[PDB]
Symmetry: C3
Subunit: 353 residues, 3 copies
Amino acid sequence: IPLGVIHNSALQVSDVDKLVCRDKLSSTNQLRSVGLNLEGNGVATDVPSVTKRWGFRSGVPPKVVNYEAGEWAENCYNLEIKKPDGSECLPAAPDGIRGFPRCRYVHKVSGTGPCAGDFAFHKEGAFFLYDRLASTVIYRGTTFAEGVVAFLILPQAKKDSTTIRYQATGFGTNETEYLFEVDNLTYVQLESRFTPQFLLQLNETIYASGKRSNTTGKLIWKVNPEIDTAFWETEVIVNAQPKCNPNLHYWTTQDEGAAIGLAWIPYFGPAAEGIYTEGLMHNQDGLICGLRQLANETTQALQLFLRATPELRTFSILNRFAIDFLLQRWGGTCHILGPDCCIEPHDWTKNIT
Amino acid sequence: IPLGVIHNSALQVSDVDKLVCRDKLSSTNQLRSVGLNLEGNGVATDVPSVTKRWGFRSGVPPKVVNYEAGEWAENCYNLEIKKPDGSECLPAAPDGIRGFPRCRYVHKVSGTGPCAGDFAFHKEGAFFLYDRLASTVIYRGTTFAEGVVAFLILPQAKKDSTTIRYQATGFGTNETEYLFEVDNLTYVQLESRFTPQFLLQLNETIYASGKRSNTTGKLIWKVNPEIDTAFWETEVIVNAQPKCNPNLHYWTTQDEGAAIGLAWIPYFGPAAEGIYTEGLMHNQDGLICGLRQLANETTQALQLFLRATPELRTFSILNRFAIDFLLQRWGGTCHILGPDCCIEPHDWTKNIT
Amino acid sequence: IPLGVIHNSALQVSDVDKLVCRDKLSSTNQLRSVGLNLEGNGVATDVPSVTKRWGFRSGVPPKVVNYEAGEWAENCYNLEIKKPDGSECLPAAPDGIRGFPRCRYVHKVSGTGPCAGDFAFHKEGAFFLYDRLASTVIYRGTTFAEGVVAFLILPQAKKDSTTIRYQATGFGTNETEYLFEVDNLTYVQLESRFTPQFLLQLNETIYASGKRSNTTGKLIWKVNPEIDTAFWETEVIVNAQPKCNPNLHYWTTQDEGAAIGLAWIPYFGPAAEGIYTEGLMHNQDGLICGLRQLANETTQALQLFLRATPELRTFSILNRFAIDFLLQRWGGTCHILGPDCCIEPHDWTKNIT
Ligand SMILES: *[C@@H]1O[C@H](CO)[C@@H](O[C@@H]2O[C@H](CO)[C@@H](O)[C@H](O)[C@H]2NC(C)=O)[C@H](O)[C@H]1NC(C)=O
Ligand SMILES: *[C@@H]1O[C@H](CO)[C@@H](O[C@@H]2O[C@H](CO)[C@@H](O)[C@H](O)[C@H]2NC(C)=O)[C@H](O)[C@H]1NC(C)=O
Ligand SMILES: *[C@@H]1O[C@H](CO)[C@@H](O[C@@H]2O[C@H](CO)[C@@H](O)[C@H](O)[C@H]2NC(C)=O)[C@H](O)[C@H]1NC(C)=O
Ligand SMILES: *[C@@H]1O[C@H](CO)[C@@H](O)[C@H](O)[C@H]1NC(C)=O
Ligand SMILES: *[C@@H]1O[C@H](CO)[C@@H](O)[C@H](O)[C@H]1NC(C)=O
Ligand SMILES: *[C@@H]1O[C@H](CO)[C@@H](O)[C@H](O)[C@H]1NC(C)=O
């Protein structure tokens, strides 16, 4: 698992032999795990194109890991897919796995498909980000964000919703048909070019202009091609992605003794949604574009690490880093003045003279 | 999370900047987590007053942590509360969560209430202590003890039931009615002044004097006010609690290779109740009163730490301490003779001379 | 928990006071947990004799630990035992616990017994090895291997199926009757001397010679005593076992970034069975016989460690080792030239002269 460290004002990857003695890890707080969205690299976010990145596969057990800080997503998805015989396709959310906390637009899709498989994975290796838990599968009726997780050592200086409903037929094949749900009886034929802002503006006009359907009669509108329709614009890490959102609007959870006046008490504290801290990080020293690349480059080593462990949810990756960090330099006999012994005796000399 | 360390024969709190080089942590056994009961500070233990410390609240996910050593409790509670429509109020105990192992009096309460909430928390932030697991909620039909957990580094020198049934109506409100269950048809109106020894002595007299009810007819006695009715008497930590039980009768589990003659084998070993070691610690160096205060002062930092993690049961707090302990002193370049480098070279000098 | 370390080309046990400064632990990869089968020591593997090593017991909660590397087993077992009233005896396999990955012969036994107990443990203290998880109980319909787990520090130089069906009556008593299932209606009276190769050769002759039973009529053959019938032949660790299989054909899971050409992606990667690496270790330096003894000598300290923890599945034993390893030498003030300070200053002297 690659580990991000900042040297020469640059984000770099190294763990095994880059024993830079100068690097200081004096607390576990400097260790962070970040879940960056695939949106930041420019992937398409429309429902038709996105669902082609997912597929069902059996014989592979699901794996879950935790991450501390996430990213505000403009798009999220919540699937309620069933088989044509009425059997659900996706498993219910396991205990403690809630939806992604921050989503501008929630694409809730309902429909049918063959579902030739127990679990639905990502065809590109990315994760499904949830509430501080990334999983390799999709859970039924749970809002998720497509993303990947990076791992960082922070320098000691400063260490830190609208629901859109769809209908689907033949989910998960080459021949799928989607319908934008205006209400229970008014539907619009979806296209790959329809943006979220376009679906909502279209929704306001159908409701206001009185173009809703009958009480039972199903009416399916269509939009002709002549109707006109990234989001944020409208070894050294090298970002080789299509685009990069140079700013990171992140979410995390804070802890401190003052607790904003007696709010620790769970009975009086916030709900599952108001526990988060927020911040805006800019691309000073090019960390944001680098970090998005780091999380992509980390995915391959992290997917195999979760394959090999029989643990359902892994929480010990950051602890295992700090242990390895101490074992590399102090795990053997420290030969003073040797390359592998970070002990400095220059202050002492002067007393001998 | 505050960490208790003994300096100048006194229990003290510090972790971040109190790098006392002299302090020796040479094994993980010196790290201990203690669950001290709220009884030790003098809180009232009668069923009517205690149930006002509990309340139902939704939208907050429950959190559980483990502790190694507990405290013998004179009072414990086991709730079997249902809603007036017949729907249970408390969730069933999750896998592996058993009752508190040591209780002199078990207050098993049965009855009804509105239960305006999924889980029932502690209105003061304390935990619900179970079998080496502290939870923030109450489980159905599981004996628990109200307590809090402290964290300690031990010096290297020496590093170490009667069921009372009640009936309730309107559980968890300002207007509740309790009944002391003599048998299935004989009941006594409860008061806040009735002690456990008083309920048992009263029980013996009702049975013996032949004052039991009919075969179906429900009879509810009452005790007039003219009937006369703590338990153990009948930055530096500063105990600011009402009272302090200066002695700690603790329970813990031991491990050693001799195993008392082939008892390790689970098929032949003890049951879930006879695995415990016991001991009696006195207030030498004022550690017991200090420790009860430490566990109270720890509660606030520990409640938020469990809010921020998506882990249902946290077992890694003690490991995370020992990692931080090594990172504070050896996590950077050790400058010999510097304040932050616990390396002593005085023995070597003499050879140079 | 004893820890295996190689000194003077010999496998040795020590952790607490054997602070050999020379020993180097520079990465968590040098830490390994091995699950060795009881076959390697020569225990009988026939179904009748083996089932007498198992027994039911209540009041003892089950415990599970993980191990990294296992051992190819010639014999495994898969029980589907029920009570005479139709109630199952064994609990269903918990989430993520699959069968033992490598088994030459799978003894699938079906039948009835009194099952005077909730869980079935090992009467000798050994574990039930599953897919990188060892448990103290038997799960229903899950293939397991009887084994024990050892713990090792590797030197930095180089750090690394046929189903046989049975029928049973009175399972788990002194009076049990077993039947070798040829098909649903042809059965052979089992004996302790019948080897797996003998049951399969017998199966081929009954099928070929046309000695199968009627369509409903149950026929039970018997083999007279005049019919003639180890497997691999047909403080310092001292192997005091009956036999020792001096070679270890192990299985483990590998992780590396190359991933054999885009196989990390779970949707495209292997199934739950093709994730394993294999290797053959010989008894160079007598490590294999020693290791089998180490895993036996470890069992007693590991069984009590799992009794004391309230954790269902323990994954932190190897991390706890590396933490203790750093705390023993760096957990206190390092007095240069002292016996307990692994710091070498000989290189520096020459500059002073
Ligand atoms: C990380 O970036 C790479 C860039 O190559 C992404 O690779 C894509 O992989 C799929 C199949 O796996 C191809 O069909 C695409 O053409 C590749 N490029 C792009 C731009 O999509 C990869 O999906 C990214 N995410 C990871 C590895 O999790
Ligand atoms: C720790 O001790 C404090 C002492 O102030 C306890 O604080 C009580 O808090 C409740 C409301 O939270 C008040 O109504 C009480 O008057 C306070 N004092 C007492 C003596 O009860 C606190 O409950 C204790 N336990 C913790 C913090 O877990
Ligand atoms: C480890 O080896 C010992 C060798 O003594 C095994 O001990 C057996 O224990 C049972 C009862 O516990 C006795 O009936 C046997 O006679 C003992 N010897 C043999 C050769 O079976 C022990 O079972 C082994 N496994 C462990 C401890 O897990
Ligand atoms: C569409 O508009 C109606 C009323 O204006 C509103 O109730 C509904 O939530 C809207 N749908 C979406 C997807 O915004
Ligand atoms: C009350 O006394 C009876 C008989 O003396 C006994 O069976 C019962 O358990 C007692 N109840 C309590 C709460 O001690
Ligand atoms: C016995 O032989 C038959 C056919 O030869 C085969 O179908 C069956 O699986 C065999 N049984 C075993 C236990 O090998």
